[PDB]
PDB file of C-alpha atoms (C1' of nucleotides) in Angstrom:
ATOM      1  CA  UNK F1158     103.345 108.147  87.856  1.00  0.00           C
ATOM      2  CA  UNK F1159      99.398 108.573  86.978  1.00  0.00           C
ATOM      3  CA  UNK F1160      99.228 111.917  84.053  1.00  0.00           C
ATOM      4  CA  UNK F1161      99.516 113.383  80.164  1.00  0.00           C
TER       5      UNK F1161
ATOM      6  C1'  DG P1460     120.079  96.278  79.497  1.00  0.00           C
ATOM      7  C1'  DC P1461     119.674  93.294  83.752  1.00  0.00           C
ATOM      8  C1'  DT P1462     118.221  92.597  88.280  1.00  0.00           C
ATOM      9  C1'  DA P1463     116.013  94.629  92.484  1.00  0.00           C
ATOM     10  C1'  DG P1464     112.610  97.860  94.900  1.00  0.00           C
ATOM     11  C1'  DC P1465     108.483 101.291  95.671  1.00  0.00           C
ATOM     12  C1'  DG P1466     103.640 102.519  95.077  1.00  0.00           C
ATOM     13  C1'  DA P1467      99.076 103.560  92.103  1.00  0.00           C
ATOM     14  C1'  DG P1468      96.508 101.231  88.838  1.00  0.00           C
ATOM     15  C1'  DT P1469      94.212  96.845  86.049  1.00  0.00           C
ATOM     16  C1'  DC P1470      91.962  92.107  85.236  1.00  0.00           C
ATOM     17  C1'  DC P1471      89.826  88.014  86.919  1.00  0.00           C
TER      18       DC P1471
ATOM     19  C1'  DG W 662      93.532  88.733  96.970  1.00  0.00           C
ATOM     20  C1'  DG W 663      96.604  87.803  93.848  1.00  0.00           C
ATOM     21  C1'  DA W 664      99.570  88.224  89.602  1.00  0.00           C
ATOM     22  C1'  DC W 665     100.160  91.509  86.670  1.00  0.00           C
ATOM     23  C1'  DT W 666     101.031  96.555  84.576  1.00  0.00           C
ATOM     24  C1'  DC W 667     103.415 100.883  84.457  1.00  0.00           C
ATOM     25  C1'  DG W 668     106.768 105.467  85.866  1.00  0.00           C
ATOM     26  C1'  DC W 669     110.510 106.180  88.495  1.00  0.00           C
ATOM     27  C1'  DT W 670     114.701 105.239  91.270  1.00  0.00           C
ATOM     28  C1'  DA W 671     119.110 102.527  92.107  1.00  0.00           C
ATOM     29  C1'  DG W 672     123.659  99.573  91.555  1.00  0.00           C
ATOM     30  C1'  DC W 673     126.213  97.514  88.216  1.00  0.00           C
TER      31       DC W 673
END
DNA sequence: GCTAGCGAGTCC
DNA sequence: GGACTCGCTAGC
């Protein structure tokens, strides 16, 4: 998984 | 924690 | 293109  | 699997992203 | 990196899921 690709966020903050 | 180990071993096994999926899919988007990184370095050469 | 390939080995590698990383978040998440799964059985044990």
């Amino acid at each position: 998984k690709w966020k903050k």
